[PDB]
Amino acid sequence: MRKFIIVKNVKVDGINAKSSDITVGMPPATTFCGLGETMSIKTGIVVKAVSYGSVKFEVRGSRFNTSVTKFAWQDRGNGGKANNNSPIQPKPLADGVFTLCFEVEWEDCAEVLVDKVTNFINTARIAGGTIASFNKPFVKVAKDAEELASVKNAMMPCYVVVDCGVEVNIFEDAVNRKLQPMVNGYKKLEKIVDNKHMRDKFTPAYLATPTYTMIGYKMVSNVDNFDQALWQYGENTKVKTIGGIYN
Amino acid sequence: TKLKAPAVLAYSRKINPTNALMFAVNWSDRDNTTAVMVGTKTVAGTQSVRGNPNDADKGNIQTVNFANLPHNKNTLLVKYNVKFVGDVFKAELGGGEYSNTLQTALENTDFGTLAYRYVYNIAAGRTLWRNRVGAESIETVITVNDQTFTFSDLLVNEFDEDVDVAEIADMVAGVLSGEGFVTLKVEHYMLLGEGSEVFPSQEFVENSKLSKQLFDLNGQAAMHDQKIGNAIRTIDTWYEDATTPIAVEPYGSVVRNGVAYRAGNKTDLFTLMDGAVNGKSLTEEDQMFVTANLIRGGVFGG
Amino acid sequence: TKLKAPAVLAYSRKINPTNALMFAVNWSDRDNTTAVMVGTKTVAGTQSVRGNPNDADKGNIQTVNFANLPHNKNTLLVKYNVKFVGDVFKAELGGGEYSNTLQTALENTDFGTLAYRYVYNIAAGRTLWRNRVGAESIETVITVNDQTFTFSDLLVNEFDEDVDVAEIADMVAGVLSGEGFVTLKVEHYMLLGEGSEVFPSQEFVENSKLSKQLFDLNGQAAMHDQKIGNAIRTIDTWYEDATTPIAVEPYGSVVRNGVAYRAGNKTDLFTLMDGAVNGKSLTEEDQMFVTANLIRGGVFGG
Amino acid sequence: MIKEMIEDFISKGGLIFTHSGRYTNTNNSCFIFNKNDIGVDTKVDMYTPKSAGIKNEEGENLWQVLNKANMFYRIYSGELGEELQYLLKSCCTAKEDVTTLPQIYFKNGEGYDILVPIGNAHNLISGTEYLWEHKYYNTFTQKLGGSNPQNCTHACNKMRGGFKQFNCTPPQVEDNY
DNA sequence: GGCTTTCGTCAACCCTTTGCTTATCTTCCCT
């Protein structure tokens, strides 16, 4: 027995489009799983999965180059060079209207759940982008599978993410089978021995290289199983769909 | 003694504006919102570069994205929201020793002047650089917590006293000095005239096809959110030999004009930040400058 | 000792005309305005070409956008709005030293003559480019600040002294030498005759498929703002061997004749602003040329 | 010569890596050589201060010669000598810096790990070469180091045309329906 | 003894120019 809260038409601008070194565009499912665990921390409603779809999404720039951001002189000790233009590190920006659907388990009324999600989203930040606007979130429940599809079709219109898996690698199949690659998680390289320059000193830290899976965009109504669009934190330091690989 | 700064001390952005969608309305019917579309024209002119007298004679053809008002609407409407977020002293990467002693030196920041200059940059039309000039009459409508204000004539280069911007600044300073958030939905009604060219954000993009490429959002002319964020924080009238407000930068640096007003004269963010942490009696105006940098946010490498 | 210009020193444009919509009226019925529609006609003629005389006998089929007056209205009307904005010396991208020393070296410029030549180019109908030939009378109605100003017969190659162009140019020079802005609502009534073919701006197109493609705004024949802006600043009678007024470029360069009237002989704009910044006293029309460049705008650096 | 080059590299800072945060930020300088991902066609990046190093008679630095005909895997499997394996591995070190790098939280089960994502160099170089080779034009191109990318990375120093990354824009929803 | 400023050091490309998908609808039945 499943419960969901849907925030439709989440207009967000200033999204850090740099998903990884080789992916620029839509934020991956690690971003929205991070947003889900962020509310698990601030609001206390513990979130299993998030199904996110893109209503609108434009990467700022041309069709072959992204619009770089005019950097500001914010480091310490480079005064005197501040009159000249700051050097640009690559961070593409994008705008996006999203539709989010969080699997939550809740025991109180739907009004306080909607208010808690609204108070989170008013202080949230989708992929480094300020949430410009969002409709009032609404609670829908998936008692059975037809009710699961009711929740699924309540995200209309949006293009959700379905996992199609890795055959050999990322570049090969992106040309061959023409699917989109995105960060489904990370791979740990080395333990980090210096916790002085970090957010926490006690949380263990690892250098990571983003693993990618290959995904497709399908409209949420054309997705047969809603579990193939709900991304959640898998126990391989990755994220994964509940329904597995989309067929 | 001599509490050093963290190497990678960072603060989040507390004035978060949205993208300024440009619509076309009439001064009469300001409810006839019509997406100003980014068009693409091609331009014949003469190439006149500092070192080009040999090639001055020949032409120069550039494809340029333009954005003009339609010839039945004489008013440019600008849509954005501005979310002022609290917890302006909560560093997310810097440690709890330098940042907390930074914070406890900054409760004596008069947040009222910061909020007044932020809302005055919102209301006077500072976020409308090249299209606030040539406008017959500007009109800013600010909606916050189901209550609406209107401003007709606010001169943008100085902050004169009016009770409406100060009344918004009361709740903005309450959010910034305290907790929570506040959101001002801003409606700019700019009587530019019939078919007057509007000025959205241009993009820093390598584009072979378009010499000038504007910012669009579904084709609709729009301005960058960090552009409006630069506009709202353009409050710094406290640097050395201060004449015009510049943007709150860590070094007071407009790289657009090629001049950094707070670099080298011991009035940047880092020297005043170390003075505030290490117990040196910071001035009120330097206090407000450091607080404005913390409101803007940034990472500080050193 | 030599003050080099900034690498990114650029000036915004200060004469901002709109796209000039053409309507059809009568010399009497100026209230009956019907939009001049851009039609498309397929036209067959000879091959011509300077070379290849073997294919002279073959035909030549080209599809051409045309714009004609209807056979019930004998007058072509051209509407545009010229916005003269002030602050012509504040470089938006170079404000500092050079730019500001150019300002102090250009304070005593005769803005009255520059504004007179601008308002005369609007008033004599030079913004009409090839429409003027065949027009029996060109009547220009310039509405400044709700101020109807009628002009009937002004020769274009010289700026003869009248009182109405000078009357508009008084406050146009007050805007240009100072701050603020002024808007000129300009209508051109030209008795071109019954069914006369009018000449709008033509787009630059590389995909071809149509030999002449006229500029249109929702189908109505219109003129590019750049063409009007070129004709307004056609004031430069101060080049070497000056016979006709040319447009103000940094190099004095017109591209039809394939020449540059001010390049290669030390009166192009960059040399003159380098002299004026470095304390070399320019002559009066020299300062008027440099200030007309700053009113036109452009980028002068590198 | 090759040994000449490996030692030219070692007199300098001398880092060979497969992953780095140098692509994310040029001020970062964290260089990581993962051992498990080295294969037959694994492109491998290297760092020198300002991309210094002498060229050969055909005008190539060490980055060209170590990256064609699987030469880095040939030195890595020691077909050209075990003392060369040593020279290669003397340059293959893991240098770490977390400043000017993203630090996110990833759930590891009843707890979180602070992951610092650094970009794979083989992904960048081999993806640029392959997607230019296989005519995949659904991409963005980014020059990483800036105006003069030799202070960034040897691959940014040589591949000045920019690296190919995937255009990850989703399909839009048409509003008029 | 670091420390912060400014000047010197080291380079060199082969590019390509839209779809990705493509929207949440009536049989029985009796009241």
TrEMBL record, chain A:
<protein>
    <submittedName>
        <fullName>Uncharacterized protein</fullName>
    </submittedName>
</protein>
Automatic annotation (TrEMBL), chains B, C:
<protein>
    <submittedName>
        <fullName>Uncharacterized protein</fullName>
    </submittedName>
</protein>
TrEMBL record, chain D:
<protein>
    <submittedName>
        <fullName>Uncharacterized protein</fullName>
    </submittedName>
</protein>
